Each structure stands twice: as C-alpha cells, then as structure tokens.
Amino acid sequence: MKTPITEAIAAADTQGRFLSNTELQAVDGRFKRAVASMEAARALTNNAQSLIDGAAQAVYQKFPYTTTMQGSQYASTPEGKAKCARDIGYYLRMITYCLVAGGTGPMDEYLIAGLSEINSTFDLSPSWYIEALKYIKANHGLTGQAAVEANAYIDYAINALS
Amino acid sequence: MLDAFAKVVAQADARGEFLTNAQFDALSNLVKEGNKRLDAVNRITSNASTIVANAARALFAEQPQLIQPGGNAYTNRRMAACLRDMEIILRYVTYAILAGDSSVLDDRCLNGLRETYQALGTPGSSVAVAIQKMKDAAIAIANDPNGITPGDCSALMSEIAGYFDRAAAAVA
Numbered sequence: 001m002k003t004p005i006t007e008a009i010a011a012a013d014t015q016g017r018f019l020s021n022t023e024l025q026a027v028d029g030r031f032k033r034a035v036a037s038m039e040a041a042r043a044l045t046n047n048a049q050s051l052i053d054g055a056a057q058a059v060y061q062k063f064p065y066t067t068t069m070q071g072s073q074y075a076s077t078p079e080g081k082a083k084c085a086r087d088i089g090y091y092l093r094m095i096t097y098c099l100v101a102g103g104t105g106p107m108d109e110y111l112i113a114g115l116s117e118i119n120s121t122f123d124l125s126p127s128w129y130i131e132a133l134k135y136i137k138a139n140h141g142l143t144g145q146a147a148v149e150a151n152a153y154i155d156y157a158i159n160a161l162s
Numbered sequence: 163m164l165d166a167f168a169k170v171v172a173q174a175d176a177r178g179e180f181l182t183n184a185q186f187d188a189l190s191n192l193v194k195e196g197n198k199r200l201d202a203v204n205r206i207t208s209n210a211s212t213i214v215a216n217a218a219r220a221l222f223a224e225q226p227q228l229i230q231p232g233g234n235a236y237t238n239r240r241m242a243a244c245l246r247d248m249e250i251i252l253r254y255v256t257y258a259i260l261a262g263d264s265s266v267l268d269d270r271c272l273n274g275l276r277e278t279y280q281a282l283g284t285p286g287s288s289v290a291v292a293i294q295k296m297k298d299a300a301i302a303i304a305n306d307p308n309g310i311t312p313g314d315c316s317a318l319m320s321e322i323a324g325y326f327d328r329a330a331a332a333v334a
C-alpha cells in the first residue's frame with residue numbers, strides 16, 4: 001500500500017541499499033504532518049453520518065432525475081438509495097484511511113483501481129460522486145492544515161473521477 | 163507491503179469500518195514515539211558494515227567448519243554470498259523497524275529462504291546464529307545511552323529483537 005513509509009523503503013529496496021538519511025527525513029515529514037492528518041481523520045469519522053447524509057442529498061439536489069428515473073442504477077428505490085449512501089460512505093471511509101496512512105494508497109487500492117470499469121459497467125455517473133465529494137469538502141468543518149489534509153485527498157478522489 | 167498504519171487500515175477495510183478512538187490513539191502514539199524509531203534505524207544503518215563483519219568473524223571463529231575447505235563459506239564466491247546474505251537480512255530487518263511491521267521482511271526476504279538454503283545445502287542453523295549475533299550488536303548500538311537525548315526505548319528494542327528472532331526462526 002502506498003504510504004510515505006512503504007514508498008521510502010521501496011526506493012531503498014529497488015536500489016538494493018540500506019535506508020539513508022534521504023528516506024529517514026521523508027518519514028519524519030510524514031510523522032510531523034500526521035498531527036494534522038489524524039485531526040482530519042478523527043473529525044471526518046466523528047461527523048461521518050451527517051457528512052454522508054448531507055452529501056447524498058447534495059447529489060440528489062444537483063441531479064433530481066436520480067430520485068425519480070426508473071432503473072436499478074438510480075436512487076429511485078429504497079435499494080438504490082441504500083446503494084448510494086453506501087457508496088458515499090465508502091468514499092468518506094477511504095479518505096479517512098488515506099489520512100491515517102499518510103498517502104493515497106488505501107484509496108488507490110480499494111477504490112480507484114477498477115473505478116472506471118465499474119462506473120461504466122453499472123451505468124453510474126462519475127459526476128454524481130464528484131458532487132458528493134464537493135459537498136464533503138465544503139462542509140467538513142475543518143480549518144488550518146487539517147483542512148488542507150482533508151481537501152488534498154478529497155480533491156485526489158475528484159481528480160480520479162474526472 | 164505494509165507499515166504499522168497501513169496494517170490497521172487493511173484490517174478495518176476488510177470489516178468495512180471507520181477507525182475507533184482506541185485505534186486512532188494507538189497510531190497517534192506510534193507517531194509520538196517516532197523519533198526513537200528513526201534513531202534506531204539511523205544507528206543500526208550507520209554501523210551496518212561493522213555489525214555484519216563482526217558477526218561474520220565471530221560466526222567463523224565459533225564454527226570453523228564453515229571455513230574449512232569443503233565448508234559452505236569456503237571459496238571467496240561462497241564467502242561473499244554469505245556476507246551478502248547477512249547484509250541483506252540486516253537490511254530487511256531495518257526496513258521492518260522503520261515500517262513498524264514485519265510484512266516487508268516476511269514477504270521480500272524470509273519467504274522461501276528456508277527452501278533456498280535447503281536446495282543449496284547452506285546450513286540454515288548457522289545463518290540463524292549469524293542473525294542472532296547481529297541482533298545483539300544492533301540493539302547495543304541502537305540503545306546506546308551516549309550521544310542522544312535520554313529516554314526509554316525498551317519497547318522499541320523489544321520490537322527490534324522480535325524481527326531479528328523472526329528472521330532467525332525463518333531460516334533455522
């Protein structure tokens with residue numbers, strides 16, 4: 001999984017060498033930034049339900065047809081509404097994992113890989129998830145570097161969907 | 163591979179849940195103790211050559227059969243291979259220390275090592291003796307109270323010893 005730490009040792013390993021000061025400084029950077037990252041992760045987790053609920057409604061408001069259009073890929077049924085809330089929660093959970101790991105690894109492996117194939121196969125619109133992510137960014141309530149951390153990973157997800 | 167953080171994340175994902183306060187606290191603690199971990203890796207790495215060479219000399223002094231004609235470390239080719247292995251083992255052990263998880267060590271080094279030595283005819287028991295030697299020397303250097311801000315690194319030394327023993331068991 002991609003993290004500043006596994007990355008640092010991956011570099012030393014590919015070079016067949018012991019870790020150097022070059023890699024140690026990298027890991028220290030990660031340890032220091034962890035303060036802001038953990039703050040962001042705890043906050044998003046604490047307010048996970050309201051963020052997911054609010055994000056889902058933001059999507060339905062931006063795209064009203066998803067609440068009425070017939071089809072299993074839409075949120076026009078209780079099962080579809082549940083699938084959607086589920087997905088939004090997955091995205092939020094992944095961002096907290098990224099903050100915890102200090103890298104995109106968690107999202108890269110559990111969500112981004114195969115993402116395009118999935119959305120295409122099940123006729124799910126990337127624009128839906130982008131709107132949910134934009135709502136989370138606008139309303140997570142974080143400030144300072146904690147907000148910088150959260151937004152970096154939220155925007156990473158948005159970019160992966162664009 | 164995985165580090166201490168990715169490990170917790172992977173366990174959580176398999177269960178589909180966010181992290182608990184206890185988990186956040188645990189990982190937060192690791193970060194709080196980070197400086198000690200960096201010091202240990204820097205110290206062991208900075209003395210890697212001496213650790214390997216001293217352990218190698220000791221091994222051959224105690225087990226002279228390895229260096230007698232016909233022995234497994236006889237000929238410069240085999241001696242070089244042996245020294246290389248010790249450096250490789252020490253290298254992956256330090257990676258595990260930095261990661262706070264043995265995954266990299268188990269996956270990229272110890273996996274199939276047993277089988278490799280068996281096919282070559284290399285005495286894994288002796289390799290384990292060499293590993294144990296580097297462990298004692300590595301911990302002595304990493305935990306040297308001189309030249310560093312005083313503090314307790316006992317838990318860290320216990321963790322480090324665990325990786326060395328893990329490697330020793332995988333080949334012995």
Ligand SMILES: *[C@@H](C)[C@H]1/C(=C/c2[nH]c(/C=C3N=C(/C=C4\NC(=O)C(CC)=C4C)C(C)=C\3CCC(=O)O)c(CCC(=O)O)c2C)NC(=O)[C@@H]1C
Nearest residue numbers: 024025028195197198200201204305306307311312313315
């Ligand atoms: C246990 C191994 C021994 C010990 C360690 C100990 N070290 C510190 C504190 C610091 N360690 C560093 C080292 C680094 N920072 C880096 O970024 C890098 C890589 C380039 C390294 C190698 C630093 C900067 C500090 C803080 C400043 C200082 O010198 O004090 C502590 C204090 C704790 C902490 O977790 O921050 C301790 C206890 N002490 C011992 O007695 C053992 C022999």
Ligand SMILES: *[C@H](C)[C@H]1/C(=C/c2[nH]c(/C=C3N=C(/C=C4\NC(=O)C(CC)=C4C)C(C)=C\3CCC(=O)O)c(CCC(=O)O)c2C)NC(=O)[C@@H]1C
Nearest residue numbers: 066072073074075080083084087090110111118122128129
């Ligand atoms: C919500 C923004 C909108 C929407 C969602 C919706 N999604 C599905 C089905 C699936 N969603 C996923 C997504 C993931 N699976 C994963 O493992 C991960 C990473 C951890 C993600 C992000 C997948 C794979 C599916 C298909 C398989 C399944 O059902 O689990 C549906 C159901 C579609 C169907 O045809 O049954 C829906 C309705 N729908 C909307 O209207 C919103 C705008």
Ligand SMILES: *[C@H](C)[C@H]1/C(=C/c2[nH]c(/C=C3N=C(/C=C4\NC(=O)C(CC)=C4C)C(C)=C\3CCC(=O)O)c(CCC(=O)O)c2C)NC(=O)[C@@H]1C
Nearest residue numbers: 228234235240243244247250270271282284285288289292
């Ligand atoms: C020294 C402690 C003992 C010893 C060792 C010895 N080892 C070999 C040969 C090999 N060692 C490995 C191990 C690895 N290769 C890797 O890439 C990795 C991970 C990064 C590991 C752990 C392998 C694959 C070999 C065989 C291939 C090669 O040598 O290039 C030898 C050579 C034996 C021979 O040529 O017949 C020796 C001598 N020997 C001892 O007597 C000590 C107890």
